[PDB]
């Protein structure tokens, strides 16, 4: 498990601020409450802060929650794929495209990090090619959120993940709008992070709104948890994770590119005590 | 034509030198 483990092993709070505009309506949205990631909770209360907000709440959760999946509530045996909190205390960068079938489409970009001891989820949001008359832009949808399957890959090229997962909002005339959602986070520090297996996190989202609370806003509690991979898995994962393998290379040339990055590998882990290798 | 062997240190570390390896030597051995 990763050195960023031990900031979540409490209650930490949490600041959300997005800056929104979709096809030329601008708002702004902050969030504030808890992260309880033992038990993969967190309680938020969105306000918006610029009147009413254009576009329908139930399409800003994801940017704005499964906006900190640091939150993520992972097993035991399970911690070793946990990029969110390996990556902290510097963060990452989270970047979406979130594609409404036949409607418009959302981008995201956020950074995710500790500032002091609260952590901060700051979005950029733009909207484009949305219809005027539709779903989203309408305020046709229900105020719900179904429970969903976040499915996490490894990428190793950019030294961090990604996500793809479909959301299914409900329409008030009974019918389903799709966001199709993209994701990519990359870490904001040079340091060693966790790349994970594939997996998925399960998701868990309820709906409700402060009878006391005068502007627009949307009261969110949200239980995450990850699976996927059985204990088995992860034990071998563990010794396979320490032994030697034995690469056969053809040609000097060949032999003497992989062997000076190999070299400069276990020079970094030994450098660092050997401190990140194979870690749970 | 001449091999060399290399200990690599952990599956995820011999995972990416294995791949990069072998998409290497699928540019040899099309016959050439």
Not at chain 1, 89 to 118: C, H, L, N, W
Not at chain 1, 143 to 159: G, L, M, W
Not at chain 1, 251 to 271: I, M, P, S, V, Y
């Amino acid at each position: 498990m990763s050195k960023g483990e031990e900031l979540f092993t409490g209650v930490v709070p949490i600041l959300v601020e997005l800056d929104g505009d979709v096809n030329g309506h601008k708002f702004s949205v902050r969030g504030e409450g808890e992260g309880d990631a033992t038990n993969g909770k967190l309680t938020l209360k969105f306000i918006c802060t610029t009147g009413k907000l254009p576009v329908p709440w139930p399409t800003l959760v994801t940017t704005l929650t499964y906006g900190v999946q640091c939150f993520s509530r992972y097993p035991d045996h399970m911690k070793r794929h946990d990029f969110f909190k390996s990556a902290m205390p510097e963060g990452y960068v989270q970047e979406r495209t979130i594609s409404f079938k036949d409607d418009g489409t959302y981008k995201t970009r956020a950074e995710v990090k500790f500032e002091g001891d609260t952590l901060v989820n700051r979005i950029e949001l733009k909207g484009i090619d949305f219809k005027e008359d539709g779903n989203i832009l309408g305020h046709k949808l229900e105020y719900n959120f179904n429970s969903h399957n976040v499915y996490i890959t490894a990428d190793k090229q950019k030294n961090g993940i990604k996500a793809n997962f479909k959301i299914r909002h409900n329409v008030e005339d009974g019918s389903v709008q799709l966001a199709d959602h993209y994701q990519q986070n990359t870490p904001i520090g040079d340091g060693p992070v966790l790349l994970p297996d594939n997996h998925y996190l399960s998701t868990q989202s309820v709906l409700s709104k402060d009878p006391n609370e005068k502007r627009d806003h949307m009261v969110l509690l949200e239980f995450v948890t990850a699976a996927g991979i059985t204990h088995g898995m992860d034990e071998l994962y563990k010794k396979l994770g320490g032994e030697y393998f034995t690469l056969q290379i053809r040609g000097r040339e060949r032999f003497e590119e992989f062997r000076e990055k190999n070299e400069a590998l276990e020079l970094k882990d030994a450098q660092a005590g050997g401190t990140c290798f194979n870690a749970s | 034509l001449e091999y060399f062997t290399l200990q690599i240190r952990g599956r995820e570390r011999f995972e990416e030198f294995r791949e990069k390896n072998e998409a290497l030597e699928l540019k040899d051995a099309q016959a050439g």
